[PDB]
Design a protein around this ligand. Structure first.
Ligand SMILES: *[C@@H]1O[C@H](CO)[C@@H](O)[C@H](O)[C@H]1NC(C)=O
Ligand SMILES: *[C@@H]1O[C@H](CO)[C@@H](O)[C@H](O)[C@H]1NC(C)=O
Lengths: 51, 51
């Protein structure tokens, strides 16, 4: 929450790709067909970046 | 001063914005009118990156 009183989204938000070759930062499609989905979670802090 | 004798500007130059919400990296406007000013300073080094 900003000082003005409005929500501010942190730049410390994280993105988690599916596991592939012992990593979660690159994902390459290796099948014939695929679908994509987004699952989101939310957490709050108090200016100390401890969610 | 470079080895050729010419002035070189360091990438370790710093920019400081006004303080807002316990930070000086993001400053935004929360009033009806604003003005902007730039205040500059210069320091010298000797290839040791110590000014
Ligand atoms: C990938 O991770 C597994 C599980 O931790 C590990 O046992 C394995 O050695 C890793 N594979 C390779 C080829 O390094
Ligand atoms: C901002 O930082 C000060 C210390 O300079 C601290 O006392 C204060 O609680 C912080 N503000 C908030 C809203 O947590």
């Amino acid at each position: 929450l900003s000082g003005y009183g409005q929500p501010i989204a942190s730049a410390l938000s994280n993105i988690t790709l599916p596991m592939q070759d012992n990593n979660t930062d690159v994902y390459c499609i290796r099948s014939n067909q695929f679908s994509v989905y987004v699952h989101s979670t939310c957490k709050s802090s108090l200016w100390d970046n401890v969610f």
